[PDB]
């Protein structure tokens, strides 16, 4: 389930979509220095790994919160269609008083 | 679904002469057929003066439907008060030209034919007895349906029908005995005995034989391409004075 | 003022203002319902009255005239 | 709403054409052609926005309907009353 979200996130990352070869091929206009391009690509990898981890953290939190809230809804529905034994005991006590 | 309109004729007109004038007027050759039928072959229906003259005029052009197949059937007997009637099917506009020519050539008085209740019962009797090439008469049983449209105050009873299945009709006929008029002798008395209805008095608009024909008060429509001799004869005794 | 159905089984009437409605079988009351609620009127006394009102019809008339006073 | 046509408008428009040439339209086909009238009008307005003399007959030649102005005022003959087709003939 979360694999779809992970694939959607990873398929739209700059490092996964653009390689370092394409990075250097595109950025020949401003600087031809390979060291500065490598440093900028390292910064790109650091920042997109950081935001990838942060997106993973928020989607995990979203999934757990959604599952917990909808599971409480399911539990409330099941309790609505079920009967607790203590209320049955109280009703039987009232009926016992009536028969008494 | 070939509706036959019926018209009586005041004179015994002979069609084997003068039809070339009609051919010249219509610019086409008609296929006139001459037959001498003897319809009441049963001993109880008469044994003398039973011969009729049957003319089958046909505006033959092509055979696809009644738009080119408006037949004309004439029946005649010289030993009657009224000697001739015609019946024609189809809806071609040349049919009224043929009627106008017949009037203006033979000087005949022609009026439409209306059937009474007992006439309709006798016609339903006539339309099941079939003549065979071996010179025998066969009663083909059809699931009839008497259909009434009474006129009552405030339109209380608009219409009512009496459906009679085929096997019940033949059971009634065999219960009555060996007869050759099943509806008038077995079916109608059984209806009168059971439901109290005298259908010869009630307003009867049509009796429907399923798959064969459904005759009405002013027209007879038949699935079969022609009209059998018994129906023509009963129509001929119907218009007598 | 009271309302009777066709077989006089499902009825409703007011004793003073209390809407007492009854389901009664053959010459014997099998069900009762006190509907009208007064601020002085309670619910346990209501249930006790509903249980007491069950029984025969002549007994209902006698006990209703008894509790009316 | 205001721009789409109605079903009874299409009955009154093409009822005689479906009667002379035997066409049977169920209600689903009627709703479908009511939907299609909007698409046809949008396509006609996209092809021809403004109206002057030569461009309409050139477009109708490009439409594949006609081949000349003779086809124009013969098609107008079978779709207009006598005064209107005479007026169109005076216009062409």
């Amino acid at each position: 389930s979360e694999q779809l979200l992970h694939n959607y996130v990873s398929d739209s990352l700059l490092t996964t979509l653009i390689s370092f070869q394409e990075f250097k091929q595109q950025l020949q206009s401003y600087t031809s220095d390979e060291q500065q391009l490598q440093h900028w690509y390292e910064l790109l990898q650091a920042r997109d790994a950081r935001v990838t981890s942060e997106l993973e953290a928020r989607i995990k939190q979203f999934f757990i919160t959604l599952r917990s809230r909808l599971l409480r809804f399911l539990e409330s529905e099941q309790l609505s269609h079920s009967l607790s034994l203590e209320t049955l005991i109280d009703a039987l006590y009232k009926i016992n008083d009536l028969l008494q | 679904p070939y509706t036959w309109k019926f018209l009586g004729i005041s004179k015994q007109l002979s069609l084997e002469n003068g039809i070339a004038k009609l051919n010249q007027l219509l610019n086409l050759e008609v296929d006139l057929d001459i037959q001498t039928i003897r319809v009441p072959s049963d001993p109880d229906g008469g044994t003398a003066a039973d011969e009729y003259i049957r003319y089958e005029m046909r505006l033959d052009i092509s055979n696809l439907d009644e738009g080119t197949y408006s037949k004309f059937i004439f029946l005649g007997n010289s030993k009657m008060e009224v000697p001739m009637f015609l019946c024609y099917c189809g809806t071609d506009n040349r049919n009224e030209v043929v009627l106008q020519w017949l009037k203006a050539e033979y000087g005949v008085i022609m009026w439409p034919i209306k059937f009474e209740q007992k006439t309709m019962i006798k016609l339903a009797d006539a339309s099941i007895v079939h003549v065979t090439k071996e010179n025998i008469e066969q009663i083909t049983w059809f699931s009839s349906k008497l259909y009434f449209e009474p006129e009552t105050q405030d339109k209380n009873l608009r219409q009512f029908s009496i459906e009679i299945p085929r096997e019940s009709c033949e059971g009634l006929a065999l219960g009555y005995g060996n007869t050759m008029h099943p509806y008038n002798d077995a079916i109608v008395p059984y209806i009168y005995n059971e439901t109290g209805m005298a259908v010869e008095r009630l307003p009867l608009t049509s009796v429907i034989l399923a798959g064969h024909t459904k005759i009405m008060r002013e027209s007879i429509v038949t699935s079969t391409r022609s009209l059998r001799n018994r129906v023509l004869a009963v129509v001929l005794q119907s218009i007598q004075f | 003022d009271l309302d009777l159905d066709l077989e006089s089984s499902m009825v409703s009437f007011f004793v003073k203002d209390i809407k007492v409605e009854l389901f009664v079988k053959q010459n014997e009351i099998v069900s009762c319902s006190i509907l009208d609620d007064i601020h002085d009127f309670s619910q346990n006394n209501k249930s006790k009255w509903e249980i007491a009102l069950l029984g025969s019809l002549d007994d209902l008339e006698l006990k209703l005239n008894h509790s009316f006073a | 709403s205001i721009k789409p046509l109605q079903i009874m408008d299409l009955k009154h428009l093409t009822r005689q054409f479906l009667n002379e040439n035997r066409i049977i339209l169920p209600k689903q086909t009627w709703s479908t052609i009511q939907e299609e009238s909007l698409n046809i009008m949008d396509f006609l307005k996209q092809k021809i926005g403004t109206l002057q003399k030569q461009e309409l007959v050139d477009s109708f030649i490009d439409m594949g309907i006609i081949n000349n102005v003779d086809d124009m005022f013969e098609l107008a003959h079978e779709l207009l009353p006598l005064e209107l087709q005479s007026r169109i003939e005076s216009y062409l």
Binding site: S12, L14, L27, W40, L44, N96, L98 | - | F23, S47, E50 | -
Partner: protein
């Protein structure tokens, strides 16, 4: 509940708009200008037919299908696991007594319902069985007392007839 709007809104808020804004801001602050514009140009170029609303709608529909399969699973688990006596296995007067009385207090229906009362922590179950057995004894005593009272009423009828 409304799970599908929450999923779609979470996608379109925290997944694509946040990604675009964060990518633009990080590429602007990486240094510079022309570098950022060009790199944004090709990353927009290769993400064609992938960030479109049809793709997010299909992703939301597929994750909804997965979640609905999980809902079917946990629904079977939560329906197959019952804790106490369920509904429709007990009388209508009992059910009405459970969730607020309908003012129709009938002795006969109560007797008929608690005569059909089902039987099974341990102390609650033992208390329920003891209460059910006590109510069965109440019903038995009620029928015996009614028949006895009818007999005594017939006897008193005959006695008063003789006395009068």
């Amino acid at each position: 509940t409304d799970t599908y709007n929450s999923i779609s809104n979470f996608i379109e808020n925290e997944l694509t708009a946040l990604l675009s804004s964060d990518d633009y801001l990080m590429d602007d602050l990486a240094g510079p200008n022309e570098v950022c514009r060009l790199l944004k140009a090709q990353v927009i170029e290769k993400r064609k037919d992938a960030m479109s609303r049809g793709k997010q709608d299909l992703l939301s529909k597929e994750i909804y299908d997965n979640e609905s399969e999980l809902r079917a699973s946990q629904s079977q688990q939560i329906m197959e696991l019952v804790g106490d006596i369920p509904k429709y296995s007990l009388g209508s007067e009992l059910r009405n007594r459970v969730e607020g009385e309908p003012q129709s207090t009938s002795i006969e229906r109560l007797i008929e319902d608690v005569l059909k009362l089902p039987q099974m922590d341990l102390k609650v179950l033992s208390e329920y069985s003891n209460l059910r057995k006590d109510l069965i004894l109440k019903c038995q005593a009620l029928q015996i007392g009614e028949s006895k009272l009818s007999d005594i009423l017939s006897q008193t009828n005959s006695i008063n007839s003789l006395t009068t």
